[PDB]
Amino acid sequence: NQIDLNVTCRYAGVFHVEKNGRYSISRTEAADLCQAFNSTLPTMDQMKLALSKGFETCRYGFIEGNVVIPRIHPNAICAANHTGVYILVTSNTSHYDTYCFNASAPPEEDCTSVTDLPNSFDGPVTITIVNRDGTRYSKKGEYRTHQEDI
Numbered sequence: 153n154q155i156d157l158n159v160t161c162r163y164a165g166v167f168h169v170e171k172n173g174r175y176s177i178s179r180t181e182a183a184d185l186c187q188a189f190n191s192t193l194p195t196m197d198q199m200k201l202a203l204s205k206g207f208e209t210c211r212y213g214f215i216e217g218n219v220v221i222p223r224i225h226p227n228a229i230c231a232a233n234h235t236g237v238y239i240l241v242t243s244n245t246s247h248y249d250t251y252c253f254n255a256s257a258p259p260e261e262d263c264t265s266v267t268d269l270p271n272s273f274d275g276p277v278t279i280t281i282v283n284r285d286g287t288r289y290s291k292k293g294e295y296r297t298h299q300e301d302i
């Protein structure tokens with residue numbers, strides 16, 4: 153009973169979380185997951201500021217209200233070569249990665265590793281935070297509050 157959460161650098165408090173190496177998070181799970189990081193789904197304004205500080209990914213993820221990809225450099229296989237906060241318009245499907253916003257993080261680029269999941273609750277799952285540099289932090293718990301997400 154294990155969940156892997158791959159996380160990024162934070163940029164103005166905003167970071168990306170990918171669960172189990174594939175698009176697998178619902179919007180309700182996303183809010184709960186960010187809550188376990190003492191975080192919230194970013195607003196579009198928070199995401200735009202993070203973009204300006206150096207944040208980009210090549211993965212769709214929830215923010216408040218939309219599913220997006222922040223892009224700095226045009227790349228043909230990431231958001232159809234767009235730059236800026238690219239907003240997903242048309243999709244059949246409902247599961248993506250998530251973004252999260254932690255207000256207590258540094259104001260600009262923070263590429264230190266994540267070494268805690270401070271607000272998870274008691275539960276039976278081995279949850280492992282996986283950093284881009286491969287360093288890991290694991291703890292037994294749960295974060296999902298909606299049964300349909302479990």
Ligand SMILES: CS(=O)(=O)NC1CCCC1
Nearest residue numbers: 189191254256257258266
């Ligand atoms: C508040 S902090 O910068 O030390 N750590 C954050 C908490 C969630 C993302 C990383």
